[PDB]
Symmetry: C3
């Protein structure tokens, strides 16, 4: 899913703003299993364009989405930023960037 | 999900028109678990507007929906009517009243 | 889902073009359970019209869909062709023939 350089960036990103815990490999495994449970191709996680397609497929479900769906969306937003080489310190900054790109 | 006065109303409502069996607390517990399973926020059951948003989210699936999906929709339609202080005797009257409001 | 005559045709249909493995009853059982998991009425597998409604419900998810979702769609496409008495040798021919029928509009 991620190259060696992308994995180094991934594991520096904090789960919550100002928190200590950071993303791990297991979050990518979890996201991949989650997409399977939602009948979405986990192979889309491998590219920026694939993550964009996943976010677009999930976005109409966000307003009413459970905590599980929101966490999945947030995780793939971070992955999109890592693929795009966008520097983000935490999950919220990636969501900010997703909103900014969509509005552009 | 329901206040004390609302729960008293809930348990007078008949599952079927003219039937003996009536709604119970377990139907609310079940509906909350069902929404989590469909990745919908169960906290939306707590308000009229939240129930309205659930019904709109589920409605495109009704035509081809399984028995489980239709029962879930019907239960939340009754819950919407209870939150709105709309007096209904049974599930069918709740569905009738919601369709007429939608036509307005 | 299928009559006895339909089951005989079903089990002659190849999963892949020119392949050896063929459709089995377990594919119908599996398709029926999959639909329940997707909150779709499995009784719709019993008729041509019901199968058309399922395919229409699933088709927008195909582009981003998992392997499981695509296999389910393809299985139901084959089942639609069997209900319609459309002769198919394999899954790919069933998808092709369904596409041609839609283009007649």
């Amino acid at each position: 899913v991620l190259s060696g350089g992308e994995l180094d960036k991934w594991e520096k990103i904090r789960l919550r703003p100002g928190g200590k815990k950071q993303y791990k490999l297991k979050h990518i495994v979890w996201a991949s299993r989650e997409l399977e449970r939602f009948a979405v191709n986990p192979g889309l996680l491998e590219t920026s364009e694939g993550c964009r397609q996943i976010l677009g497929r999930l976005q109409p479900s966000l307003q009413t989405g459970s905590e599980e769906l929101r966490s999945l969306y947030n995780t793939i937003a971070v992955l999109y930023c890592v693929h795009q080489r966008i520097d983000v310190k935490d999950t919220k900054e990636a969501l900010d960037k997703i909103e900014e790109e969509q509005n552009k």
